[PDB]
Amino acid sequence: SHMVSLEDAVIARLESHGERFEVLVDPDLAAEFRREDSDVSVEDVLAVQEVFRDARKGDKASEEAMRKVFETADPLEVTPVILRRGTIQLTAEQRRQMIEDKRLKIINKIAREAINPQNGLPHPPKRIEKAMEEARVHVDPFKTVDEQVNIVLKAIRTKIPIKFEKVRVAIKIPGEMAGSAYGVISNFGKITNEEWQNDGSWIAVVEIPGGLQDSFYQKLSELTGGNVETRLIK
16 A cells, blocks of 8 residues: 655645645655646645645644635645646755656666667667767656656657667467466567467567567576577568
8 A cells, every 4th residue: 555755755835925835745646646637636645634834844724824825725625736736846865866766767768668760779778878968868856757758768869869669579489488488478568469389389479669679588588598589570
């Protein structure tokens, strides 16, 4: 059962005519809540169901002040307005930790999904990282990894040849390993076709994120102790 630690909670703040209203929120869930068509409930976003004047100092808002500003004193009705119209306040440590966390996740997600369209091959994480530096990418502490991946990809595509692309790999493995390979495959992609062979081996066509071509081969080879054949489809 999930909860934001009080250490990890951030503040969402809304000011009206010089008066602050603040709530303590899970930063990941708060970011999701801000997205279009999110299924995250406000109850899951809030660390406590209380509206503060100052959330770090613990001074809380009057019901009268909330009614004046929001036309409601219900924290579950006030909070969505603060989240959608307000700002996010981070401590120095939180900003540093969040940027670092998201930076690594962005590098990995790009490395996983991307290929070099010139040769069809993956870019190692280190290459993506180097491109981000060249493009002087600033990672945001708060924006979701999903949103930032697209921003960052656009920024680095002038530095390196890069595109998100799924690829299809045909694999051939001994029949004894087919059950086991299904489990490995499910970490990497989706089986689009599979056929037991006349000779007892098993062939599967697997659609994977293009940046995983080498990792996929490595895991399959380790599983089958080298008893695997792979090729890119066509």
